[PDB]
Design a protein around this ligand. Structure first.
Ligand code: B5Q
Length: 209
């Protein structure tokens, strides 16, 4: 398969290095960030449904699924949101994050906490607090299925997903660090969801193993 490799923009690469090497025990914030991104993707496609009703022909249900898998050591966050095009993954996410990183890093020096990352539109990268590798499968109405991947280290890869079609939405697969397996435990996910995502306007299903 034709795998394309891209360098992260200097600011994002730096933010990712900050997230990976900074001593910070309150790692559970990653979940709230990912669910908050999923809720936004669901708001975007729910808004599109009003003007044009044909955009829902790739799945009518607007929901969030939390899928732990102890065998694979993965925590998957699935949404039936707007999804991303190839341009979204390469250019659009790169430029929105470029401005976000600068705003957040200046705020960190001005008294802000790492838990305030989401206010800068870079909440996604908090995934690297618990994950050694992140794989993103995405499908937008105006494009094909793409798989994005990064183990940080300054690069990401993009390829056309030859795997299982998902219709529309985004699947964030967190390949958890060795010492971060508590995020595969039902009671731990439940407690995090109740504490930080108690008022999300879409159903959140926690899968059992
Ligand atoms: C702002 N939303 C609209 C938008 C406009 C331009 C570009 C994309 C999007 C878009 C659409 C659907 C989304 N759905 C989910 N669940 N998450 C995100 C997200 O913020 N991500 C950050 C990120 C970084 C690296 C790889 C992957 C990701 C994913 C999404 C982003």
């Amino acid at each position: 398969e034709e795998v394309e490799t891209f360098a992260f923009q200097a600011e994002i690469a730096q933010l990712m290095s900050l997230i990976i090497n900074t001593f910070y025990s309150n790692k559970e914030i990653f979940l709230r960030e990912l669910i908050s991104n999923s809720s936004d993707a669901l708001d975007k496609i729910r808004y599109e449904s009003l003007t044009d009703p044909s955009k829902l022909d790739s799945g009518k249900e607007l929901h969030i699924n939390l899928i732990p898998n102890k065998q694979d050591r993965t925590l998957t966050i699935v949404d039936t949101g707007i999804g991303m095009t190839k341009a979204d993954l390469i250019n659009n996410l790169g430029t929105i994050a470029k401005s976000g990183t600068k705003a957040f890093m200046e705020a960190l020096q001005a008294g802000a906490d790492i838990s305030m990352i989401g206010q800068f539109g870079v909440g996604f990268y908090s995934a690297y607090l618990v994950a050694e590798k992140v794989t993103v499968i995405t499908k937008h109405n105006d494009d094909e299925q793409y798989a994005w991947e990064s183990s940080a280290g300054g690069s990401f890869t993009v390829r056309t997903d030859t795997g299982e079609p998902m219709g529309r939405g985004t699947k964030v697969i967190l390949h958890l660090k060795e010492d971060q397996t508590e995020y595969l435990e039902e009671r731990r996910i439940k407690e995090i969801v109740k504490k930080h995502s108690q008022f999300i306007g879409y159903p959140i299903t926690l899968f059992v193993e």
